[PDB]
Amino acid sequence: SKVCEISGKRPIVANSIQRRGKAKREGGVGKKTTGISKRRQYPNLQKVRVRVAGQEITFRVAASHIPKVYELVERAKGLKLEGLSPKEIKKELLKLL
Amino acid sequence: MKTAYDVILAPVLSEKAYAGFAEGKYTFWVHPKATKTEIKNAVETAFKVKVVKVNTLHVRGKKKRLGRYLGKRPDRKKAIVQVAPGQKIEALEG
Amino acid sequence: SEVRKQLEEARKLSPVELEKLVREKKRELMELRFQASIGQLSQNHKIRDLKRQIARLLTVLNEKRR
Amino acid sequence: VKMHVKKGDTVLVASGKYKGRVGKVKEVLPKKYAVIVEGVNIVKKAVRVSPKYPQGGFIEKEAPLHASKVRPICPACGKPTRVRKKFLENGKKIRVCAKCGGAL
RNA sequence: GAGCCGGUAGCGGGCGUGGAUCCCUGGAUGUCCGAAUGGGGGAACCCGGCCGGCGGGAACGCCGGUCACCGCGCUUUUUGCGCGGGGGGAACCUGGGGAACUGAAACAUCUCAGUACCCAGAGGAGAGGAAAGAGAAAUCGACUCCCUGAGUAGCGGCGAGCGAAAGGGGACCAGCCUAAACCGUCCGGCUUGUCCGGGCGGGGUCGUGGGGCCCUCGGACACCGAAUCCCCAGCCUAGCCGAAGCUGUUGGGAAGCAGCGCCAGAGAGGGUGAAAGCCCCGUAGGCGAAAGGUGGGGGGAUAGGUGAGGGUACCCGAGUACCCCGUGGUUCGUGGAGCCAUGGGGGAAUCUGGGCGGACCACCGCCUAAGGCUAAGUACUCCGGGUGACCGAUAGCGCACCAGUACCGUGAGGGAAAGGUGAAAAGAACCCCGGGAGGGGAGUGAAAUAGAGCCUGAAACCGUGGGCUUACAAGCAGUCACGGCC
RNA sequence: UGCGAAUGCCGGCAUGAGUAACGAUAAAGAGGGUGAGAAUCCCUCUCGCCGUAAGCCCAAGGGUUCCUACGCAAUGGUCGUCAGCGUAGGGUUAGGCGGGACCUAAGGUGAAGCCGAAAGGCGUAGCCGAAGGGCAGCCGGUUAAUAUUCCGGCCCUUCCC
RNA sequence: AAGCCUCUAAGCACAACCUGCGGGAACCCGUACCGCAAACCGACACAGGUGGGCGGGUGCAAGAGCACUCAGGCGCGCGGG
Ligand SMILES: [Mg+2]
Ligand SMILES: [Mg+2]
Ligand SMILES: [Mg+2]
Ligand SMILES: [Mg+2]
Ligand SMILES: [Mg+2]
Ligand SMILES: [Mg+2]
Ligand SMILES: [Mg+2]
Ligand SMILES: [Mg+2]
Ligand SMILES: [Mg+2]
Ligand SMILES: [Mg+2]
Ligand SMILES: [Mg+2]
Ligand SMILES: [Mg+2]
Ligand SMILES: [Mg+2]
Ligand SMILES: [Mg+2]
Ligand SMILES: [Mg+2]
Ligand SMILES: [Mg+2]
Ligand SMILES: [Mg+2]
Ligand SMILES: [Mg+2]
Ligand SMILES: [Mg+2]
Ligand SMILES: [Mg+2]
Ligand SMILES: [Mg+2]
Ligand SMILES: [Mg+2]
Ligand SMILES: [Mg+2]
Ligand SMILES: [Mg+2]
Ligand SMILES: [Mg+2]
Ligand SMILES: [Mg+2]
Ligand SMILES: [Mg+2]
Ligand SMILES: [Mg+2]
Ligand SMILES: [Mg+2]
Ligand SMILES: [Mg+2]
Ligand SMILES: [Mg+2]
Ligand SMILES: [Mg+2]
Ligand SMILES: [Mg+2]
Ligand SMILES: [Mg+2]
Ligand SMILES: [Mg+2]
Ligand SMILES: [Mg+2]
Ligand SMILES: [Mg+2]
Ligand SMILES: [Mg+2]
Ligand SMILES: [Mg+2]
Ligand SMILES: [Mg+2]
Ligand SMILES: [Mg+2]
Ligand SMILES: [Mg+2]
Ligand SMILES: [Mg+2]
Ligand SMILES: [Mg+2]
Ligand SMILES: [Mg+2]
Ligand SMILES: [Mg+2]
Ligand SMILES: [Mg+2]
Ligand SMILES: [Mg+2]
Ligand SMILES: [Mg+2]
Ligand SMILES: [Mg+2]
Ligand SMILES: [Mg+2]
Ligand SMILES: [Mg+2]
Ligand SMILES: [Mg+2]
Ligand SMILES: [Mg+2]
Ligand SMILES: [Mg+2]
Ligand SMILES: [Mg+2]
Ligand SMILES: [Mg+2]
Ligand SMILES: [Mg+2]
Ligand SMILES: [Mg+2]
Ligand SMILES: [Mg+2]
Ligand SMILES: [Mg+2]
Ligand SMILES: [Mg+2]
Ligand SMILES: [Mg+2]
Ligand SMILES: [Mg+2]
Ligand SMILES: [Mg+2]
Ligand SMILES: [Mg+2]
Ligand SMILES: [Mg+2]
Ligand SMILES: [Mg+2]
Ligand SMILES: [Mg+2]
Ligand SMILES: [Mg+2]
Ligand SMILES: [Mg+2]
Ligand SMILES: [Mg+2]
Ligand SMILES: [Mg+2]
Ligand SMILES: [Mg+2]
Ligand SMILES: [Mg+2]
Ligand SMILES: [Mg+2]
Ligand SMILES: [Mg+2]
Ligand SMILES: [Mg+2]
Ligand SMILES: [Mg+2]
Ligand SMILES: [Mg+2]
Ligand SMILES: [Mg+2]
Ligand SMILES: [Mg+2]
Ligand SMILES: [Mg+2]
Ligand SMILES: [Mg+2]
Ligand SMILES: [Mg+2]
Ligand SMILES: [Mg+2]
Ligand SMILES: [Mg+2]
Ligand SMILES: [Mg+2]
Ligand SMILES: [Mg+2]
Ligand SMILES: [Mg+2]
Ligand SMILES: [Mg+2]
Ligand SMILES: [Mg+2]
Ligand SMILES: [Mg+2]
Ligand SMILES: [Mg+2]
Ligand SMILES: [Mg+2]
Ligand SMILES: [Mg+2]
Ligand SMILES: [Mg+2]
Ligand SMILES: [Mg+2]
Ligand SMILES: [Mg+2]
Ligand SMILES: [Mg+2]
Ligand SMILES: [Mg+2]
Ligand SMILES: [Mg+2]
Ligand SMILES: [Mg+2]
Ligand SMILES: [Mg+2]
Ligand SMILES: [Mg+2]
Ligand SMILES: [Mg+2]
Ligand SMILES: [Mg+2]
Ligand SMILES: [Mg+2]
Ligand SMILES: [Mg+2]
Ligand SMILES: [Mg+2]
Ligand SMILES: [Mg+2]
Ligand SMILES: [Mg+2]
Ligand SMILES: [Zn+2]
């Protein structure tokens, strides 16, 4: 679970590719791969900790989608409950029907 | 069902078991799951007797072989019951 | 036959009596055990079809409540 | 196991040593597919001196015949195969011999 | 439709034409463990709460019922309730992850290979699917699968090797729901306002661009019609009918041989004492469901669908397209490297908008992304059936036999051997030797060196009897010659 | 589809060979018994060995081996009439002993919570977890075989009313 | 950590608790047998390994040592020469 609670973004596997030599297009004989190996790429994930109704709700999101946390706060109707709260404010409110 | 002729299986028949008729002590094969308490009531209502002490013990199957195939007879349980002073169980007096 | 009638008399006779009739046959069965156990005192098949007829009763007893 | 012939029946023994003889089926064994007619096949089985017939050495007994070995007698013939009719409600046997009882 | 109480005889008892046993459908009962779910726990054991019951029954015990967690939904949050989920499945399927040996005759890129495998999920299939496609023809029209294109185009330490698509021929055939504009309703927040927001209903769903809003046209029976529901046929889960031969003869046995017959929509095949169309069971041809399953076919219903011109420029899926960085997918290994995907940064517009035709620019075309669903043609084989120039007990599955067993391993796990008397038990009464075992008679049998350590019964091996031979010869043991004895 | 070889595979049967060995150098002898059969079984006598054990009691572990009747194919390193072996029958009795309807330890597990591609890791309380803590039975008789369990005497504990 | 005692809290104080006495109530599992070994771990009736307790007497300085012995148990499952 290092995954963005709004966007859905999660870590992907990627190769890290080590190259040598001069681009063919700089008049080099061309690039060469000295190694290829798997790494991954995490989302740039942050806390957004926000106050909604009585309570203080904390989203874990990709820094990318940080705005949508505030969009979800602009959606306010009638919740006096505990944390959860976002269980409501979430995909129920992100999409629904 | 509500038993109680389910709880009491059969009289156990041996020099040992017979030697208990002399005192108030009658001894039966009972169903393996039966608590001392319910064995009491099952005898109290089967033989119209008062039961003042129950003793139980489990009896393990004996492994037996018909040749090539070995297995074991069922595990049993037996209760030896103390009927109240002077009472007896005539059903067991043959 | 016997069974046909036994099954027929058992319906129309309903449940408290069915329970009592069971409790009876059960006790009649326990007696049967004892006699086979002490040996020579039983000619079997009565053990079998008493057991069985207790089933038949109990199966009707089940009909009646459902 | 369908057979053809039953207990009451009268059969002719169509093959073997007892070939040609007619007798009544004394018993039918569907599991071994055998009928034992009598006294249409007998044999001699030596027996021990234990109780009844203590002194007895031997016994004659009727050995089952393969159910194919025999054919139904057909009241008047010694054929048939067999056939089937219906009317109401159902059931039958008939001689395609033809045409006859069994029945008994 | 006459026998039955399994393999299994026997003792000792019972049942069946008043229709048993047995087969098929439904039901009932269904201890305890197990997702295991009251709570524990070393699975098959232990300990409880609540309501009810039993016993003399308060203590004790038994019985019935109820009580896990998670998600969704309404509900006054609450007392809660409803519905669902969970686990298993031979292979097949998708998705998340993902090797090495090996190949390169060394080895790094490359290969093996997105394989093995591990994980999640789905179902009887799964996936995919209704163009921001192809890609050179004013071309084609969803998706999947086969053939072909083609070992082509390409890719490539341009090595080893990797390896497309368009098109054509087939199989199958199907197309739909939405978001927004706009209208209506309910509720919530309020700095009551032609307000903002959420919920529901309507509306609308496309690329010869569509739709909303305004005007005009008539827009009337309409026609169309499900993938949803209902009925029905048919199919599956038991069964049933089903032609035509006798005699004689050898023989233990006829089905052989002989005589004279007969059936055939049936001369497939298996049995029966040996070799049988006509003895048995079948076969060709027919028939059959009260009940449960199915039902893609037939029928019917319902849901849904259905216009023209003008004018407005209101809407047409956002952290999205687009650009850049890092990568993956493709035949494409950085290459002129686009296209599809996306971890990071910046970050639009709504038809005069956007994406694409292999860097980029023009021109000319194609298509309308950022929501969703969609039979069939396809994969598989735990399961049932039918066939075999498939095996026939060292073979065929590991197992033809009470095998995933014995046994071996702490465990994961490994893992065997072992079929055949006879047509029929007629499975050898009785006597004899003997403690028994065994054998001799007797008897059974066509046969008993078919006698159960039983079909055939090879060879190595062991033995008894007989013939020739051998104790002054010595050698790969044989061979050629002569002679003796049988 | 033809086997003689692969330290081939599976099976069978040879050779070595009546050979080595028969598992502690604590040690045997005789009389009687039984039985088809006796060095080997039973009983007497004598002799030898253990005795901080080679005796007795408990916990693991084993799981009927227990007691008795009948029995000797095989198992027993010989023999077997015996047996820990075959067949059969019997045999284990608890309010107080052990454990559980008590506690907590390491550790485990885990409402909350935290983390992690999935699987899953972590974690407060709680819960589980004992050869620790807590808790009420002693002496004797009895069976072929059980006894702080049955019986006899003398004591005790907790729940309910 | 509980049992245990004390303290109070809501609560209840016609409850409750304490002490004494009396009547009743008291469930599940283990219990044979071997257990320094022929019954456990060692393919074996294997000279190996296996935790706790008791372990008598006489003598030798002491002792759980050594010798001999009690109770109890054994002469080791081939023998004869
Ligand atoms: Mg890099
Ligand atoms: Mg912040
Ligand atoms: Mg940004
Ligand atoms: Mg007990
Ligand atoms: Mg009847
Ligand atoms: Mg016929
Ligand atoms: Mg009928
Ligand atoms: Mg009988
Ligand atoms: Mg009928
Ligand atoms: Mg059924
Ligand atoms: Mg029941
Ligand atoms: Mg449970
Ligand atoms: Mg309960
Ligand atoms: Mg649990
Ligand atoms: Mg109650
Ligand atoms: Mg699953
Ligand atoms: Mg499932
Ligand atoms: Mg994958
Ligand atoms: Mg490599
Ligand atoms: Mg390598
Ligand atoms: Mg290489
Ligand atoms: Mg090489
Ligand atoms: Mg190398
Ligand atoms: Mg690859
Ligand atoms: Mg599923
Ligand atoms: Mg499908
Ligand atoms: Mg789909
Ligand atoms: Mg490849
Ligand atoms: Mg094509
Ligand atoms: Mg089409
Ligand atoms: Mg709508
Ligand atoms: Mg509004
Ligand atoms: Mg709407
Ligand atoms: Mg609509
Ligand atoms: Mg327009
Ligand atoms: Mg027929
Ligand atoms: Mg003759
Ligand atoms: Mg003839
Ligand atoms: Mg001829
Ligand atoms: Mg034939
Ligand atoms: Mg012929
Ligand atoms: Mg034939
Ligand atoms: Mg037919
Ligand atoms: Mg506009
Ligand atoms: Mg672009
Ligand atoms: Mg690539
Ligand atoms: Mg690339
Ligand atoms: Mg390169
Ligand atoms: Mg371009
Ligand atoms: Mg694009
Ligand atoms: Mg294009
Ligand atoms: Mg295009
Ligand atoms: Mg669009
Ligand atoms: Mg779309
Ligand atoms: Mg689909
Ligand atoms: Mg099959
Ligand atoms: Mg074989
Ligand atoms: Mg085999
Ligand atoms: Mg063979
Ligand atoms: Mg095999
Ligand atoms: Mg094992
Ligand atoms: Mg003769
Ligand atoms: Mg003979
Ligand atoms: Mg012969
Ligand atoms: Mg023979
Ligand atoms: Mg034969
Ligand atoms: Mg032979
Ligand atoms: Mg000779
Ligand atoms: Mg000389
Ligand atoms: Mg000479
Ligand atoms: Mg020499
Ligand atoms: Mg030899
Ligand atoms: Mg020698
Ligand atoms: Mg020597
Ligand atoms: Mg020697
Ligand atoms: Mg010895
Ligand atoms: Mg010795
Ligand atoms: Mg001493
Ligand atoms: Mg034990
Ligand atoms: Mg053992
Ligand atoms: Mg035994
Ligand atoms: Mg003994
Ligand atoms: Mg004896
Ligand atoms: Mg022996
Ligand atoms: Mg011996
Ligand atoms: Mg024994
Ligand atoms: Mg007591
Ligand atoms: Mg506990
Ligand atoms: Mg505890
Ligand atoms: Mg944990
Ligand atoms: Mg403890
Ligand atoms: Mg303790
Ligand atoms: Mg205690
Ligand atoms: Mg004592
Ligand atoms: Mg004892
Ligand atoms: Mg006492
Ligand atoms: Mg506590
Ligand atoms: Mg009291
Ligand atoms: Mg005991
Ligand atoms: Mg004992
Ligand atoms: Mg010790
Ligand atoms: Mg000892
Ligand atoms: Mg011993
Ligand atoms: Mg020994
Ligand atoms: Mg030892
Ligand atoms: Mg041992
Ligand atoms: Mg030690
Ligand atoms: Mg001392
Ligand atoms: Mg001393
Ligand atoms: Mg001293
Ligand atoms: Mg000294
Ligand atoms: Mg000493
Ligand atoms: Zn006739």
Statement: the CB of D59 is under 7 Å from strand E: no
How far out from the chain centre does Cα B59 lie? 11
* Coil/strand/helix, residue C52: helix
> Six-digit token pair at A39?
């790494």
Q: Which nucleotides of strand E lie under 7 Å from a protein CB?
A: 1-4, 7, 12-19, 27-29, 31, 54-57, 60-63, 72-73, 77, 97-99, 108-110, 114, 179, 187-189, 197-200, 240-246, 252-255, 271-273, 276, 279-282, 319-320, 326-328, 333-337, 342-347, 402, 423-430, 442-445
Phi and psi at A72, nearest 5°, equal -65, -25
CA-CA distance, B74 to B78, in Å (whole number)? Answer: 13
Q: 10 Å Cβ neighbour count for A35? A: 10
CA-CA distance, D84 to D55, in Å (whole number)? Answer: 52
Number of alpha carbons in the 13 Å side-chain half-sphere of residue C29? 23
Q: With an 8 Å Cβ cutoff, are C22 and B1 in contact?
A: yes
> Six-digit token pair at D7?
């207990």
From the list A87, A75, A84, A94, the residue with the least C-alpha distance to A6 is A94
Count the residues in chain A.
97
Q: Enumerate residues 6+ apart whose C-beta is below 8 A from D73.
A: D9, D10, D11, D12, D22
Number of alpha carbons in the 13 Å side-chain half-sphere of residue A86? 17
Between residue 20 and residue 59 of chain A, the positions with Cβ below 7 Å from nucleic chain F are 42, 58
Chain B residues with CB under 8 Å of a chain C CB are: 1-3, 5-6, 8-11, 13, 46, 91, 94
CA-CA distance, D69 to C30, in Å (whole number)? Answer: 51
Of B5, B13, B94, nearest to C27 by CB-CB distance is B5
- Measured from Cα to the C1' atom, the residue closest to G25 is B37
C59 contact residues in B (CB cutoff 8 A): none
CA-CA distance, C42 to C35, in Å (whole number)? Answer: 6
> Six-digit token pair at B68?
């090539």
Q: Which residue has 């369908």 as its token pair?
A: D2
- In D3-39, which positions are buried (b, 16+ CB within 10 angstroms) versus exposed (e)? eebeeebbbbbeeeebeebebebeebeeeeebbbbee
C35 contact residues in B (CB cutoff 8 A): none
Nucleotide nearest to B60 (CA to C1'): F64
Distances (CA, A) of B35 to A75, B6, B30, C16, C34: 65, 13, 10, 27, 22
Count the residues in chain D.
104
From the list B61, B57, B33, B34, the residue with the least C-alpha distance to B46 is B34
Please report which residue ranges of B1-94 form alpha helices under DSSP H. Answer: 15-18, 36-47
Statement: the CB of B77 is under 7 Å from strand G: yes
CA-CA distance, A76 to C59, in Å (whole number)? Answer: 62
Please report which residue ranges of chain C form alpha helices under DSSP H. Answer: 2-10, 16-37, 46-65
Going through chain A in order, the beta strands assigned E by DSSP cover: 12-20, 32-41, 45-52, 55-62
Mutation choice for B interface testing from C18, C29, C30, C56 by most B CBs within 10 A: C30
User: Distance, in angstroms, between B86 CA and closest chain C CA?
Assistant: 24
Give the resolution in Å. 3.1
CA of A85 to C1' of E198 (A): 15
CA-CA distance, B93 to C2, in Å (whole number)? Answer: 35
Q: Which residue has 């009565």 as its token pair?
A: C46
Q: Which residues pair with B65 in a beta bridge?
A: B70
Statement: the CB of B37 is under 7 Å from strand G: yes
Statement: the CB of B10 is under 7 Å from strand G: no
CA-CA distance, B87 to B42, in Å (whole number)? Answer: 16
Q: Which residues pair with A45 in a beta bridge?
A: A62
Statement: the CB of B36 is under 7 Å from strand G: yes
Phi and psi at C18, nearest 5°, equal -65, -45
CA-CA distance, C33 to B11, in Å (whole number)? Answer: 9
CA-CA distance, D68 to D86, in Å (whole number)? Answer: 26
Of C23, C29, C33, nearest to B2 by CB-CB distance is C23
CA-CA distance, D45 to A29, in Å (whole number)? Answer: 106
* Coil/strand/helix, residue A13: strand
CA-CA distance, A79 to A69, in Å (whole number)? Answer: 17
The CA-to-CA distance between both ends of chain A, in Å, stands at: 27
From the list A60, A58, A55, the residue with the least C-alpha distance to A82 is A55
From the list C1, C16, C6, the residue with the least C-alpha distance to C52 is C6
Dihedral of CA C38/C39/C41/C42: which sign? positive
Q: Enumerate residues 6+ apart whose C-beta is below 8 A from A94.
A: A6, A72
Phi and psi at A45, nearest 5°, equal -105, 130
* Coil/strand/helix, residue C61: helix
From the list A27, A10, A28, the residue with the least C-alpha distance to A19 is A28
Kindly write down the DSSP assignment for every residue of chain D, as one continuous string.
---S--TT-EEEE-SSTTTT-EEEEEEEETTTTEEEEESSSEEE----SSSSSSS----EEE--EEGGGEEE-TTTTS----B----SS----B-TTTS-----
B12: DSSP letter: -
Residue D43 identity (one-letter amino acid): V
